[PDB]
Amino acid sequence: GTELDYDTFCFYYDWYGSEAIDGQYRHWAHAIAPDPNQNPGTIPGTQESIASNFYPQLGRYSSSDPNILTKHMDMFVMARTGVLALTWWNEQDETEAKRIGLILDAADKKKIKVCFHLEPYPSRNVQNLRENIVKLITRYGNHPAFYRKDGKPLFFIYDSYLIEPSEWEKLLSPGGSITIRNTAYDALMIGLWTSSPTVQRPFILNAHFDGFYTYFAATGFTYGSTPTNWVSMQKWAKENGKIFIPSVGPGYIDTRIRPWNGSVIRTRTDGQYYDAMYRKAIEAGVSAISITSFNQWHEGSQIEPAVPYTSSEFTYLDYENREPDYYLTRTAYWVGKFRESK
Ligand SMILES: OC[C@H]1O[C@H](O[C@@H]2[C@H](O)[C@@H](O)O[C@H](CO)[C@H]2O)[C@@H](O)[C@@H](O)[C@@H]1O
Ligand SMILES: OC[C@H]1O[C@H](O[C@H]2[C@@H](O)[C@H](O)[C@@H](CO)O[C@@H]2O)[C@@H](O)[C@@H](O)[C@@H]1O
Ligand code: NA
Known part of the structure; x- marks a missing residue:
């Protein structure tokens, strides 16, 4: 009825600061992106003017605040979402290490699991990726909240297409020169499907994701x-021994930080947009879903x-x-439907 689902992965961002913990409102203050097609300015992260079209119930919170983390884990329980997929930027700073430890300890108190979402950090390549996979498994692999499926950690890889399949093969083919296959550091590696099947099918197969x-x-x-492409993507995945994890969300709007990106706005319609995405994922017959x-908050997908x-600077959605x-409650509803279908 109400247990957590460990085939549901929710993308989580730990880059927010507050005056209480950090001494600064990090990410609530954010640079405005220049138009790709310029001195754009910065959103200052004051109480009146934050880097979101929405406004958090918890205010300008810190991701390093243990009291905020506790409340977030309670929210995961309400939503029935069993895995927290943590943004990871290879910052190599004491604050990053501290935050990951706090999040693991908070998660474990409510039986939530943690996996890593490997970001496009500067000079990311298959060698430093191996080194960082080994570090993350060695440092956190024995924590009880660290996620495993059939004994294997799982990593999502954002903008994986930035690295060529001939490089990925070295890390992910069983014969690869620096392979993790059949080693203590083997893992499930989930790459990003972007463009048409004529490009993506050979990319995924050749990269050995x-x-x-x-x-x-x-x-x-x-x-x-x-x-509408998800049924055929699931059929291809099952035929080729690959795990498909479609991503579902409640809406999108990023125009405070990207004022030129209005064409990407997707309206919430009181939950109906979220319902339509989640239904299609379940209808495709997938064995795992990402949220x-x-x-x-910057992209309005929360x-x-x-x-x-409201303020004189901005009226929030x-x-x-x-x-x-x-x-949170509507997520719990759809987790119930997904579990019926498994
Ligand atoms: O939204 C601003 C944010 O954009 C970039 O981060 C990406 C976004 O969070 C989104 O597209 O999800 C990606 C995967 O988690 C992530 O890379 C960065 O440029 C970031 O610094 C910025 O704050
Ligand atoms: O430029 C706006 C756009 O930025 C980010 O997406 C970029 C890249 O990371 C994606 O892989 C490709 C996919 O075609 O598009 C962009 O180049 C995201 O933050 C995105 O939400 C945003 O609209
Ligand atoms: Na699972």
């Missing part, structure tokens, strides 16, 4: 994030509770006519 995900909460942003996102808020915790 164990599976693929789609990430984007905005329908139609890519081929992969267009749900974009718990708390990407299921974390939000509240009404909010969840009305639904209540602030609607997207």
